């Protein structure tokens, strides 16, 4: 129901939080210029020659 | 230091912007003249703003426009009302005969005015910026008023100096040496400071001055205190910044030579293929 | 890190009412002298074990991980725990600011140490001073 | 290295040949955007700032001179006004008037050739944006006054959060468009399809740049060790986010843009650049002594 | 017979007057020239703002002479 | 396999940085000679 | 910690890596021995402040020298577009 954030161990009956996820939207963002780049180029390139 | 003067940091850039602007005009630098406002509480007189006049030249002196100050003043008592005149400024180095001249006309207007200069051809690491004062000396016969310094300091309120640090930050040859240039700077009298406790320690050691037992237990403190930080996850992030920036200026390397390849393919598009 | 063999003189001047204990096995003494011993703790510290925190607030041993557990969720102490290990993590650094902090303390150090030997000795700072700028 | 105007010097000369041709030709009544670049001097600046702190909570305002290269507004001087305002109303019944072509006047004695190139305003706290009536205002002043822009300042945002806000507007004509939206909304005025903001850049002098320099610094661990490169992290991720946006619009505009994008991510990778090398240079500096 | 009028920002336009008109007058012929708002209008003279309803006896402008034209302007 | 914080990760970037460099510099080059032959200037 | 409250020293103390991490420190006392010891070491902070100096101002005159360069080789490219265009109109 999306009310804890973590989860569950069964093998040791653990329940592992989410004290994690620093800030590295950054990393995400930096892959979109990759998914864009690329395009890009292909764009570039299929001009002729 | 006889009277007391504040000084604050709105007057000298006044006089820079003014200075900057006549020499645009004009071309070859010449002497500015101004005029200054402020409080004068008891014996501490604080300089906050300073408005330009137009002087006039007759044979080989200059005359200020009297009427034009009276408007001035009229005009600037709606906006700044309780400042009175305090004196002018002027640019250049040691004071000259012109600057004995203006002051003369300028105490008629109030009795005992104040002496400002700015080096704009400064070749040292000094402020350009100094105060005088007219005292009427023992000379011989007719006394000249003699231009005697005074100790002036830097007071300054919030909104002037969150501005001045607003300008300082802000900022040709490149952004790289406007870059590099405010931390050589830095470095160098960092450096100065080093050699200074260097030669005061190494003083102690010949005996030169007396031999005083608190200093040198601070500086060898400092001394033990330089290897800052040498642990393994300190370096572990530290590469992962550099690695970081790295693939950045990669990924931003990359998309200008996309635009040179872009400009080549559509520059050789119509010489040697057509459509 | 006040501890409650040096406290019985407090204790000796104290109303009934505000003595009175609140039927929890421990005295509101106890309760306030122990809270502020884990949140002096939670400063000069960066991870502790609880066998080892069982001797700083007296304490038998798990009430102690109760008290933290209490003390965090209220807006008082920062800082996760660990049951798995039973350690408990009050705050750490992440290197770069340690750095910066580092340079703060060095410069400040220098600054002080050259406002000192200026008003030692005026004349010989005064001398190299202006030997160095020529 | 003084005498001669480089660069820096070069925007700082009144051709009073070319601003006639400008004025005469008046190339913005054709195009509606012709006008996208604002560069203000920074005694413009300086002056503005302590004349919007100096009243306090009270709206003050003024004129400011300056001329029009091509697309660019190249504001040289600001100027204050003896007025009556409240904290959002003003009126300027007669005494700014009065103190206005008499200031006109008189400066054009003392060597100021520049003239009315548009006013700036300062909102206290309130966001930087055209008012439901200062946009009616820049309606009339550029129905006949054409070389001009609308200047907004908050002295609150500034003071509080330490960044200018500053914002240099123009209005559309009446009748030029191009159910309101709830983003756009916010952050502008009611009337923000009616007016667009401008690119807002500063220029000094080459005497300004070395009084700086010179002026203080200390600055150890207060700028050679801030966390640069890190404090800007919001910035730099709002940067590269839109960069993707600005990057798929030249990409759909080829199937310019382009260069304007190129320079937009060359501007972030220089900065973080710069970063990098200060890091270094601190490394080498502190780190590796007494091995 | 060769009036001219300036604008605070650099426009001179040439008009013609006369003797025994009122500035009400000038003003209706200078938008008529080009659609100024008559109410947003202020004239300047050597630094004095001219009254409108006193019909033109003593504001002397024999030759050359240049009025001075302000817009209003709110800032509310 | 990897973590990517090692130098080596940083010499392997700057390896494709100086032939990205030396790439975008030829490219230049062709682009330069090109705007200079006679038989263009003439097609625009 | 006793040691810690006297203000001698400022440190954290760690009990999963048993780590003590301090940060400043008072000096003890000086012999007339180690003087030299500081000495050296204040030499050795100079010598590098300068050999740091230097390489900056290296590092900004190769970045000038190469942008005037590269301005060089666009006027030069400039001049010659400008002379062909010039001989075209014959």
Redesign the interface.
Do not use: M, P
């Given at each position: 129901d999306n009310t804890i954030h973590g989860r569950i161990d069964q093998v040791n009956q653990?329940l592992e939080?989410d004290?994690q996820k620093r800030?590295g939207?950054?990393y995400t963002?930096?892959d979109?210029?990759?998914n864009?780049?690329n395009?890009?180029?292909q764009?570039?390139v299929s001009?002729?020659? | 230091g006889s009277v007391s003067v504040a000084l604050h940091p709105l007057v000298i850039l006044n006089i820079s912007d003014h200075w900057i602007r006549m020499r645009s005009q004009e071309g070859r630098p010449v002497q500015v003249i101004g005029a200054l406002i402020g409080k004068q509480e008891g014996r501490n007189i604080e300089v906050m703003n300073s408005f330009e006049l137009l002087s006039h030249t007759v044979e080989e002196k200059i005359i200020i426009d009297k009427e034009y100050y009276y408007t001035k003043e009229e005009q600037f008592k709606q906006v700044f009302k309780e400042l009175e005149f305090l004196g002018w400024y002027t640019t250049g180095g040691p004071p000259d005969p012109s600057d004995i001249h203006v002051h003369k006309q300028v105490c008629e207007i109030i009795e005992s005015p104040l002496f400002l200069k700015l080096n704009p051809m400064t070749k040292h690491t000094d402020l350009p910026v100094s105060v005088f004062e007219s005292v009427i000396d023992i000379i011989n016969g007719e006394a000249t008023m003699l231009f005697a310094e005074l100790t002036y300091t830097l007071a300054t309120e919030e909104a002037e100096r969150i501005g001045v640090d607003h300008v300082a930050r802000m900022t040709e040859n490149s952004t790289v040496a406007e870059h590099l240039i405010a931390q050589h700077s830095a470095i160098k009298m960092l450096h100065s400071r080093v050699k200074l406790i260097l030669e005061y320690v190494k003083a102690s050691e010949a005996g030169e001055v007396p031999f005083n037992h608190e200093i040198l237990r601070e500086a060898y403190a400092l001394c033990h205190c330089l290897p800052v930080l040498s642990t393994d996850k300190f370096k572990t992030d530290f590469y992962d910044q550099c690695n970081d920036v790295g693939l950045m200026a990669y990924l931003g390397t990359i998309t200008k030579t996309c635009n040179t390849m872009n400009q080549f393919v559509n520059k050789f598009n119509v010489l040697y293929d057509r459509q | 890190i006040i501890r409650g063999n040096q406290l019985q003189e407090f204790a000796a001047m104290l109303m009934p009412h505000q003595k009175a204990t609140t039927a929890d096995g421990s005295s509101i003494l106890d309760r306030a002298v122990i809270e502020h011993n884990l949140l002096s703790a939670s400063k000069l510290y960066n991870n502790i074990t609880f066998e080892e925190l069982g001797a700083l607030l007296e304490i038998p041993a798990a009430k102690a991980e109760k008290i933290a557990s209490q003390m965090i969720t209220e807006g008082r102490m920062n800082g996760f725990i660990d049951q798995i290990d039973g350690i408990v993590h009050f705050e750490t650094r992440e290197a770069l600011p340690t750095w910066d902090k580092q340079i703060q303390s060095l410069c400040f150090q220098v600054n002080n140490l050259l406002e000192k030997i200026s008003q030692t000795a005026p004349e010989w700072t005064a001398q190299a001073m202006e030997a160095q700028m020529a | 290295n003084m005498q001669e105007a480089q660069s820096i010097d070069e925007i700082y000369k009144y051709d009073k040949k070319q601003q006639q041709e400008i004025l005469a030709a008046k190339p913005w009544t054709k195009d509606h955007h012709y006008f996208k670049y604002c560069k203000i001097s920074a005694l413009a600046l300086l002056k503005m700032v302590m004349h919007a702190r100096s009243g306090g909570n009270l709206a003050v305002m003024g004129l400011m001179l300056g001329k029009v290269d091509g697309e660019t507004m190249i504001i040289m001087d600001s100027f204050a006004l003896p007025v009556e305002g409240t904290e959002t109303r003003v009126n300027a019944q007669a005494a700014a008037y009065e103190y206005m072509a008499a200031y006109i006047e008189n400066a054009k004695q003392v060597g100021r050739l520049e003239n009315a190139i548009g006013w700036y305003h300062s909102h206290p706290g309130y966001g930087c944006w055209l008012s439901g009536i200062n946009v009616s205002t820049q309606m009339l002043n550029q129905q006949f006054q054409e070389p001009f822009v609308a200047v907004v300042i908050d002295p609150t945002r500034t003071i509080s959060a330490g960044k200018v806000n500053l914002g240099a507007f123009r209005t559309y004509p009446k009748g030029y468009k191009p159910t309101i939206p709830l983003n756009k909304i916010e952050d502008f005025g009611v009337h923000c399809k009616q007016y667009y903001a401008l690119e807002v850049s500063y220029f000094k002098s080459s005497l300004d740049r070395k009084l700086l320099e010179l002026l203080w610094n200390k600055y150890w661990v207060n700028t050679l060790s801030s966390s640069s490169l890190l404090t800007n992290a919001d910035y730099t991720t709002g940067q590269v986010f839109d960069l993707s946006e600005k990057l798929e619009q030249s990409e759909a505009q080829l199937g310019d843009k382009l260069a304007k994008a190129t320079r937009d991510s060359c501007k972030t990778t220089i900065e973080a650049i710069h970063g990098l090398m200060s890091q270094v240079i601190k490394d080498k500096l502190f780190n590796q002594i007494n091995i | 017979m060769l009036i001219k009028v300036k604008t605070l920002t650099g426009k001179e336009i040439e008009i013609d007057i006369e003797p025994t008109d009122k500035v009400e007058r000038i003003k209706e012929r200078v938008e008529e020239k080009e659609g100024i708002p008559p109410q947003q209008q202020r004239l300047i003279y050597s630094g004095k703002q001219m009254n409108d309803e006193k019909t033109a006896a003593d504001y002397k402008i024999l030759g050359g002479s240049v009025l001075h034209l302000v817009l209003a302007l709110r800032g509310g | 396999p990897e973590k990517y914080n090692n130098p080596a990760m940083l010499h392997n970037i700057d390896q494709e940085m100086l032939k990205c460099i030396e790439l975008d510099e030829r490219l230049k080059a062709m682009d330069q000679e090109i705007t200079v032959n006679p038989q263009f200037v003439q097609k625009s | 910690i006793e040691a810690v409250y006297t203000d001698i020293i400022q440190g954290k103390l760690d009990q999963r890596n048993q780590l003590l991490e301090v940060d400043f420190c008072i000096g003890r006392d000086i012999r007339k021995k180690d003087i030299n010891n500081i000495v050296k070491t204040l030499h050795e902070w100079c010598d590098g402040c300068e050999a740091v100096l230097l390489g900056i101002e290296q590092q900004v005159l190769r970045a000038n020298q190469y942008k005037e360069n590269h301005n060089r080789t666009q006027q030069q490219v400039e001049a010659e577009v400008t002379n062909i265009k010039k001989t075209l109109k014959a």
């Open positions: 653990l939080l004290h800030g939207a950054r963002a930096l979109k210029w990759t864009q780049l395009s890009l180029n764009a570039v001009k002729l020659a | - | - | - | - | - | -």
